[PDB]
Symmetry: C2
Subunit: 401 residues, 2 copies
């Protein structure tokens, strides 16, 4: 995936948007743009609204102003996105016809958007029912432990907070089981107990509102007496079957910054494809996502796993506003990865060929995710602005059918 | 102009929950949407959760917070936060986190040309009269409204209004200063995230 990032950062055309005017600057030193046309497209939440093509005629180190025709003023809600791509119409010795050599995306105008579930309480769980949908929250764990559509269970593993990732080579550095490197991210995480932290239930309560049921939970993650993380959640299940999850996390200032702040569950279903409105199509992370474009992407599940020979956290897509998998839809503003391999398996397997697809599908939905680094892979390389150091984090999801 | 989208109340087991949603609009465009929850529990504490959406295409707002005019005028302001002096997100390195206690007058900086002033950042507790606010916020507290400051050319023309204006911000824009004839607020101090969340607890 990184290659695409390189391609984007090294591209020979730079773009600047001013109103509806695109300034295309050539970083070629010698050649005129004699085999380039600029395709542009305006889209609303992934739906195209207008497009066009303009031949590039820009001298080396020169500028070309391209005036866009009046773009649409869709009175519907959502964010307009302008995407430009430079296409080489004719083949070269090194490229086929239609080769994409450069691209850029900007946000245009945004228009902001302007039966009651029955609760049954037992000593062991809260059960919420609405039509053929059923949610089961375990009161001893404090987590959404099962979901039914009709009679079919949807979860193999409860929906739980996740603050760790299968370490990247950049997280490990030169640290080895025999020769620990204490400044490596993985060693700091392990020493702080991030991978061994035991969730402790502080609160689990249910309450029926006028048109919804509200489940409020609070957990503390602890290691050797120290509280690393506190998660306080609210689950609001309303008369439309939509489960709105609000998550507020506190992170101890003195514990190493966590790799991620999100949720994970093992979904019982395995679907052939993953659809999402977000950055894609390829794997992208907070400090490697410039090359990714915001759009409606639809890929086979296999393409959501990057087969790094040394397994690690992989396949994240950021800036995601909608995720569709099977009958499930998640909405919000999150990063996600979706695969057949748990973070645990990735972490404890040395070679990709030794991975075995687990039952169902592991979904990691993150409100926040740490950078991956890469300035070097033998010292901490994640820049401060990509570390999860804020101490308090908030994210909201909506899970529905 | 604030437009009410939602205002609903609901009694929980041990608290009352008021949920509201407002849209700020100008000439047909929605600039901001605020969605709040007020949870008043059996201890008298009012927990306020605020989630704000800001249109990507509107200029980044100077602040995202709350304001009210308190009826009381107290002699002193106590706070656990950055101080003792005025500090802003791009000017707070010199401020120290501590328990500070100053006369109310010292919470107003008398710039000859009136403007936003007196902000204290990184504040976890604020005590004024019988009121206590808790969370992680920036605040200023004075006898002068933002409107009066904006519409008055000289400090000597300011008149203390009835009571005390409290501005509690979850977020506040930088002040700049590289120059004062062009935009100087660096990107990392502009409120550009599009979505903001902050929580307060107001009690006696």
């Amino acid at each position: 995936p990184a290659l695409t990032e390189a391609k984007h950062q090294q591209q020979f055309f730079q773009f600047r948007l001013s109103g509806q005017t695109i300034e295309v600057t050539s970083e070629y030193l010698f050649r005129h743009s004699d085999n380039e046309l600029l395709h542009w497209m305006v889209a609303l939440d992934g739906k195209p609204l207008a497009s066009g093509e303009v031949p590039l005629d820009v001298a080396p180190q020169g500028k070309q102003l391209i005036e866009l025709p009046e773009l649409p003023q869709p009175e519907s809600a959502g964010q307009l996105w302008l995407t430009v791509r430079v296409v080489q119409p004719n083949a070269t010795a090194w490229s086929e016809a239609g080769h994409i050599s450069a691209w850029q995306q900007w946000r245009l105008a945004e228009n902001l958007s302007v039966a009651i579930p029955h609760l049954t309480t037992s000593e062991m769980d809260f059960c919420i029912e609405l039509g053929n949908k059923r949610w089961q929250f375990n009161r001893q764990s404090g987590f959404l432990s099962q979901m039914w559509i009709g009679d079919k269970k949807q979860l193999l593993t409860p929906l739980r907070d996740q603050f760790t990732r299968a370490p990247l080579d950049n997280d490990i550095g030169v640290s080895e089981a025999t020769r620990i490197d204490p400044n490596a991210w993985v060693e700091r995480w392990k020493a702080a107990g991030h991978y061994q932290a035991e969730a402790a239930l502080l609160q689990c309560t249910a309450d029926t509102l006028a048109d919804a049921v509200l489940i409020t939970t609070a957990h503390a993650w602890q290691h050797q007496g120290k509280t690393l993380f506190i998660s306080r959640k609210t689950y609001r299940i309303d008369g439309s079957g939509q489960m709105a999850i609000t998550v507020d996390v506190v992170v101890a200032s003195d514990t190493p910054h966590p790799a991620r702040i999100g949720l994970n569950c093992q979904l019982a279903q395995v679907a052939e494809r993953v659809n999402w409105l977000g950055l894609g199509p390829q794997e992208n992370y907070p400090d490697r996502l410039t090359a990714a474009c915001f759009d409606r992407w639809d890929l086979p599940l296999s393409d959501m796993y990057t087969p790094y020979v040394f397994p690690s956290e992989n396949g994240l897509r950021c800036g995601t506003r909608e995720l569709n998998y099977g009958p499930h839809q998640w909405r919000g503003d999150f990063q996600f990865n979706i695969s057949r391999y748990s973070q645990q398996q990735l972490m404890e397997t040395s070679h990709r060929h030794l991975l075995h697809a687990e039952e169902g599908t592991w979904l990691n939905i993150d409100g926040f995710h740490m950078g991956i680094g890469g300035d070097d892979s033998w010292s901490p390389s994640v820049s401060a602005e990509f570390q999860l150091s804020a101490g308090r984090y908030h994210y909201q999801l909506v899970w529905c059918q």
